[PDB]
């Protein structure tokens, strides 16, 4: 089976991430992280003019880090022009060198692209590739990918893109469901953001397999707490690129509320959203087929969902689902960008059980007397005492049917509990059907003694009936029975176990 998305940003998670981004600033790095995370999510800064003044005031024109963070933050702020000197231009062009790390190249290139300064993109790539021939680490490779998402397409980015098929093999796979780097959450999120930003700016579809991207996003969202501002920035950028891009939009499909009791409604509703929980309002959805788990035969097919506001909704009141589990195949259609657009979901139809025609009876174990029977019916408790001893045996026969349809039922739980009214000891037996689906129970005191421990007395008799599909589980006090085993000679030796108990002159 193809993998469905197991983790994403819910409507709540997107808002908690927005809260985890709207934090006070403490350095240009923090303003960069917050502003660019919000803007990646599409959220705004209320005080953008003040944030711009903050970037202006904190901008050191002599420090590469300050220049990078200010450039990208002011590009993220509207109308936020900032004075830049020719010495800053020379500094940024000098930082792009073989005498610098790939990280320093990244800062210098993103500063130039933020301010809007010319760059010898092919020569910048020559330095990038030369340094990246030593700095073959994952982080430097990701920063080279982001550099190539700033370098002109006229640069020979082929040798940078070829690192993607290396990194994808340098991912560690947590078993069928997740893919991540060992460098963890932030590196995975920034790698996904860099890969998509790069491929969208170069204008080629990413080479990563869609199911591998599904495992990568499952790994990114496998943790829902993002501690530093940089973790929130990275995760927000990854959610942003996976929200809206030219190539791959992950189709979240989930049931609205618990799909467990729909027999109260006989309506199915599907949420169909991206990983920001935005509904794909331009999608279309259909039930391709529904099968019964009890037979694996189909029941319904080729039937379309309708968009009804946010959800896609399908009426099926007209098809008479019996009690059971049913699997619906559903597909999401429309924009060819959709991935994982087909989902198999497990719906459950519930019912209520009618117990009827229960006959409670006793028989003289030699059959010299005809059977005595008392008719009973839930909830009516049986009247008078019934005796099961070395002469008379005792039995129950009862029938369970669906109250609505009258079909046979075979509930998962159907236990008979005899509760000793004095000692409070219980004995529990399981009743089983015959081929006619009539349940029968008999008590033969000469046999069950090993169950009762031969404890004679009055027992309250209960029926316990219930199932995962049953809306209405029964615990009925049906009768009271006195069970008199032939007398044990010495109970006390077995009862010994209760060891937490509280001369003179003449």
């Amino acid at each position: 089976w193809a993998l469905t998305p197991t983790h994403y940003l819910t409507k709540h998670d997107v808002e908690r991430l927005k809260a985890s981004l709207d934090r006070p600033f403490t350095n240009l790095e923090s303003a960069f992280y917050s502003i660019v995370g919000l803007s990646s999510l599409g959220a705004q800064v209320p005080d953008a003019k003040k944030a711009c003044t903050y970037i202006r005031s904190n901008l050191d024109p002599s420090n590469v880090d300050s220049l990078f963070y200010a450039a990208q933050a002011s590009q993220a702020l509207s109308g936020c022009e900032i004075s830049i000197s020719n010495e800053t231009k020379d500094l940024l062009l000098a930082a792009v060198s073989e005498d610098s790390s790939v990280t320093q190249i990244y800062h210098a290139v993103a500063a130039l692209s933020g301010f809007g300064l010319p760059l010898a993109s092919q020569e910048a790539l020559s330095a990038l590739t030369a340094r990246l021939s030593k700095e073959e680490t994952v982080l430097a490779t990701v920063q080279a990918l982001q550099t190539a998402s700033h370098l002109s397409q006229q640069a020979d980015l082929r040798s940078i893109v070829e690192e993607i098929e290396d990194l994808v093999a340098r991912l560690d796979e947590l078993g069928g469901v997740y893919l991540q780097f060992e460098e963890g959450l932030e590196t995975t999120a920034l790698f996904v953001a860099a890969t998509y930003k790069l491929m969208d700016h170069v204008g080629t579809e990413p080479s990563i397999k869609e199911d591998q991207v599904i495992q990568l996003m499952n790994a990114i969202f496998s943790k829902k707490n993002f501690e530093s501002l940089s973790e929130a920035f990275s995760v927000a950028s990854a959610a942003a690129v996976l929200s809206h891009n030219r190539y791959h939009v992950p189709v979240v499909v989930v049931p609205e509320g618990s799909a467990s009791d729909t027999h109260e409604q006989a309506i199915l509703r599907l949420q169909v959203t991206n990983v920001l929980s935005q509904p794909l309002t331009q999608a279309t959805v259909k039930l391709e087929h529904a099968k019964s788990v009890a037979s694996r035969a189909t029941v319904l097919q080729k039937t379309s969902f309708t968009p009804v506001g946010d959800v896609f909704e399908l009426n099926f009141m007209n098809v008479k689902f019996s009690s059971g589990y049913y699997d619906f195949l559903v597909e999401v259609e429309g924009d060819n960008r959709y991935i994982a657009n087909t989902v198999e979901l497990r719906v459950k139809i519930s019912t209520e059980v009618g117990i009827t025609n229960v006959d409670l009876s006793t028989v003289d174990k030699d059959q010299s007397i005809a059977p005595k029977t008392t008719r009973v019916t839930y909830p009516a408790k049986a009247k008078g005492t019934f005796i099961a001893d070395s002469h008379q045996n005792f039995a129950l026969f009862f029938q369970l049917v669906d109250v609505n349809t009258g079909a046979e039922l075979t509930p998962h739980q159907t236990f008979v509990r005899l509760h000793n009214q004095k000692t409070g000891q219980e004995v529990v037996f399981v009743a089983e059907p015959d081929n006619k689906n009539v349940y029968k129970f008999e008590l033969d005191t000469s046999e069950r003694k090993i169950e009762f421990d031969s404890a004679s007395g009055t027992y309250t008799l209960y029926l316990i009936i219930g199932d995962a599909t049953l809306k209405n589980p029964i615990l009925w006090n049906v009768a009271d029975v006195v069970i008199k085993f032939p007398e044990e000679e010495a109970p006390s030796t077995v009862l010994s176990q209760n060891l937490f108990t509280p001369r003179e002159p003449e």
Binding site: A259, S260, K348, Q413, F415, R417, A468, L470, P473
Partner: protein, 102 residues
């Protein structure tokens, strides 16, 4: 794959399988050194039932399942007799070794 099942005290928050059980504090052992001297609201359990071997006297039956609960394969019909049924189902059990290991 087995679970504790309870069709009468499953929590409203259950996923639809009747296996998240609200264990009543009436079942909680009468031993405040173990369970704490203050009163407790109902407690949520979701896991595998276990049976204390009657052969071992030292076993501490700390939290029994409900009289209605039992342990079985939830999907598969009850051909065999359950491993645990009724108040015999233990959700939490303790041991006090003779060296007083716990």
């Amino acid at each position: 794959k087995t679970a504790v099942i309870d069709h009468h005290n499953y929590d409203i928050s259950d996923l639809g399988q009747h296996t998240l059980i609200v264990a009543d504090t009436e079942n909680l052992l009468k031993a405040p050194t173990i369970v704490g001297k203050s009163s407790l609201n109902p407690i949520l359990f979701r896991g595998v039932g276990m049976v204390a071997d009657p052969d071992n006297p030292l076993v501490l039956d700390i939290l029994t399942g409900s009289s209605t609960s039992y342990s079985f394969f939830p999907d598969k019909p009850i051909t065999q007799y359950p491993h645990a049924v009724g108040k015999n189902t233990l959700l939490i059990a303790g041991l006090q070794a003779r060296n007083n290991a716990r």
